[PDB]
Design a binder for this molecule. Structure first.
Ligand SMILES: CC(C)CN(C[C@@H](O)[C@H](Cc1ccc(F)cc1)NC(=O)O[C@H]1[C@H]2CO[C@H]3OC[C@@H]1[C@H]3C2)S(=O)(=O)c1ccc2nc(NC3CC3)sc2c1
Lengths: 99, 99
């Protein structure tokens, strides 16, 4: 689809068997999801944004379905205020900015 | 133009007579720029992101030229780590997401 930006660009995702909403976020390098139950091993990581840093769990080779498009990649899980789909997954579903 | 997301979507802006680079950020409601010299009155505001809040100065009806497109609107100025162009200005230059 084409998405204008008069509202937040929220989409439905399926990850770890669960349905969630997430923001398509071109300003995010990585994908960061609110605390949730994912299986398997992970590695600690710290990421920074406008107000400081947060500690997240890094999961690799995670399957995520984003508005009906499948992608596999790294997902960070931790105390983000909003679920974010970052460029690591936006590139895999073919997402572009246009003006 | 059309912009893919394999790199950060950075663009040149002109604001307050000064040239800067900024991220086209669909995950940002508002536009937030690093400390800089702007003329005129402003109002204090606090905004939140991944790691907490920051205090910014809110300037209204500011002219900004974003990759050669003029827009007028609110610009927030404060300790953001990156210049961000948010949806309040992205809508005025006709920017869309596509996949
Ligand atoms: C540069 C910065 C923009 C990146 N952020 C992406 C922006 O899109 C965030 C998304 C957001 C929305 C709401 C919210 F509550 C919190 C965050 N928006 C944001 O702060 O906006 C603020 C501000 C704008 O006006 C209003 O609208 C939303 C909210 C409010 C005030 S990030 O989330 O910090 C990020 C994400 C992924 C990532 N991956 C990394 N990987 C390391 C490098 C390898 S670093 C890293 C950092």
């Amino acid at each position: 689809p084409q998405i204008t930006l008069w509202q937040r660009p929220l989409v439905t995702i399926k990850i770890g068997g669960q349905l969630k909403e997430a923001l398509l976020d071109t300003g995010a390098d990585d994908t960061v999801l609110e605390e949730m139950n994912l299986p398997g091993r992970w590695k600690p990581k710290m990421i920074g944004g406008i107000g400081g840093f947060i500690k997240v769990r890094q999961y690799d080779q995670i399957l995520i379905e984003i508005c009906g498009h499948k992608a596999i990649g790294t997902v960070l899980v931790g105390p983000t205020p909003v679920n974010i789909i970052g460029r690591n997954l936006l590139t895999q579903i073919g997402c572009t900015l246009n003006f």
